[PDB]
Design a binder for these strands. Structure first.
Ligand code: MG
Ligand code: MG
Ligand code: MG
Ligand code: MG
Ligand code: MG
Ligand code: MG
Ligand code: MG
Ligand code: MG
Ligand code: MG
Ligand code: MG
Ligand code: MG
Lengths: 107, 62, 50, 50, 31, 63
RNA sequence: AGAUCUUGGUGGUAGUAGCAAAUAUUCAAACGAGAACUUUGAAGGCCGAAGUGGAGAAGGGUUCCAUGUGAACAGCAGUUGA
RNA sequence: UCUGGGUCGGGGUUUCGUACGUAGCAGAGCAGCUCCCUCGCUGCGAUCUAUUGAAAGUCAGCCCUCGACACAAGGGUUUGU
């Protein structure tokens, strides 16, 4: 379908490894944007503020290794824009990351 | 396949690994990796370090 | 080839197969498992399979 | 690459009939597949492909 | 009076920040 | 759309610096409608402006 | 045609040198045609009271404030601006 | 394509060295309670032991999966004796 929502866990440690201290969290934002870009194919990607806060919870350089996010493709037929579908990425708190798949959550 | 040695930790030093060390008194010691050397030279008791064989035998573990 | 460095019969005694991804100290998995015995992950795995 | 324990048969050496640990390398060599034959004819200008 | 619909939305607007921030006390409009 | 004068007036009114002045983000055009300290006081009565509490500097550790 | 001539204009260099002193920014929303730079909120930081805080002297003289503009300036940009 | 390659997960390897919580007549001692106990019980207490070669990391330029997910026969520009 085209309004699907899914649940992901992101190896931020994998995508951050090598970048300098004071770029770790902003590059983490860029890499989660590109993750959603390549997942949903939606040029418009919006990051929830609670997710940004969850990224920066340990300062600029002690970025968490693993983040459990949730992507949601919604209709952009609310105004005249070149892109008709966008992806909200919402932070999903978890107590552990062991044995977590990518699971298709309902609406 | 040569003569087998046991480290500061009592491990299994296969040939072509680690280092040996000599002292003025004549004692000869062999070590598996630089962690064992650094532990030994700091005068750290092997029986107190958690992961060595001597600790395991002192605590009956396994 | 005419030197004694060539024309050498090679008869190997031991072939090292420890981990090159760090300081390996075990040749093979069987020797490692015998050396260090059951672990926590093996304990819970044998719990799942009873 | 890895290292090998082996025996020495070098007369006149300090290491005659003594063990050595020597660095070696592993190069994987899966079998070839012959798929062509090409011929070269000798020329004054070199060696051209016939 | 409050029902489920009113409280369910009121929870969102009363929280104006992260954990450890003051909750909103009132939002009243007058003419 | 632009709220620097209103923020300055609110900081002068509430006797707290611009750090402790909170303007409601969703409701903006009524704040922009404010141009005088009297309307600012009407809004501070209406709750659209909130003085933020002080950042805690706990002395339990020192005690 | 010369005078390291006088005045003025224009080339290559060259879209080159460069726009690197003082830790650092990120998300959402608004306005607007346009947003890295404006505003608001959230977050993370810094000055750390011998401050990047609050007021004066000399000096400046309207730079103070309100509203509007996106000509020029603010060596990028600007919906902002001494 | 006898699919493919990714993204998570799993297993391996390895690094460090035994996590939080819980229990303990372990613990230098100290402060309270004795119809009570006849030597007890309630706290404070660094550190120690069991849970625990545990916990955590582990490719981004480490190895193997056949587990889950969706993605992939799509775009653009040129080229002729
Ligand atoms: Mg190595
Ligand atoms: Mg002349
Ligand atoms: Mg001249
Ligand atoms: Mg340049
Ligand atoms: Mg520069
Ligand atoms: Mg700070
Ligand atoms: Mg500081
Ligand atoms: Mg001052
Ligand atoms: Mg400019
Ligand atoms: Mg001014
Ligand atoms: Mg893995």
């Amino acid at each position: 379908n085209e309004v699907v929502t899914r649940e992901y866990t992101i190896n931020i440690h994998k995508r951050i490894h090598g970048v300098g201290f004071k770029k770790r969290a902003p590059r983490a934002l860029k890499e989660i944007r590109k993750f959603a870009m390549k997942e949903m194919g939606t040029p418009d990607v919006r990051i929830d503020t609670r997710l940004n806060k969850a990224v920066w919870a340990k300062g600029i350089r002690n970025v968490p290794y693993r983040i459990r996010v949730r992507l949601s493709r919604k209709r952009n037929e609310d105004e005249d824009s070149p892109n008709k579908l966008y992806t909200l990425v919402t932070y999903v708190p978890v107590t552990t990351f062991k044995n977590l798949q990518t699971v298709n959550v309902d609406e | 396949m040569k003569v087998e040695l046991c480290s500061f930790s009592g491990y299994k030093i296969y040939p072509g690994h680690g280092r040996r060390y000599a002292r003025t008194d004549g004692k000869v010691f062999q070590f598996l990796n630089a962690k064992c050397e650094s532990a030994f030279l700091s005068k750290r008791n092997p029986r107190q370090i958690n992961w060595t064989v001597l600790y395991r035998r002192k605590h009956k573990k396994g | 080839q005419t030197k004694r460095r060539a024309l050498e019969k090679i008869d190997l005694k031991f072939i090292d197969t420890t981990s090159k991804f760090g300081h390996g100290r075990f040749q093979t998995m069987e020797e490692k498992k015998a050396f260090m015995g059951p672990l926590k992950k093996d304990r819970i795995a044998k719990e799942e399979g009873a | 690459m890895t290292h090998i324990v082996r025996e020495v048969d070098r007369p006149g050496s300090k290491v005659n009939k003594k063990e050595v640990v020597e660095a070696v390398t592993i190069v994987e060599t899966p079998p070839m597949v012959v798929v062509g034959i090409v011929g070269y004819v000798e020329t004054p200008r070199g060696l051209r492909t016939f | 009076i409050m029902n489920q619909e009113k409280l369910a939305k009121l929870q969102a607007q009363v929280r104006i920040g992260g954990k450890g921030t003051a909750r909103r006390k009132k939002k009243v409009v007058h003419r | 759309s632009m709220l620097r004068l209103q923020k300055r007036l609110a900081s002068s009114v509430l006797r707290c610096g611009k750090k402790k002045v909170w303007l409601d983000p969703n409701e903006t055009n009524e704040i922009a409608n404010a141009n005088s300290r009297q309307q600012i006081r009407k809004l501070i009565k209406d709750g659209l402006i909130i003085r933020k509490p002080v950042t805690v500097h706990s002395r339990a550790r020192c005690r």
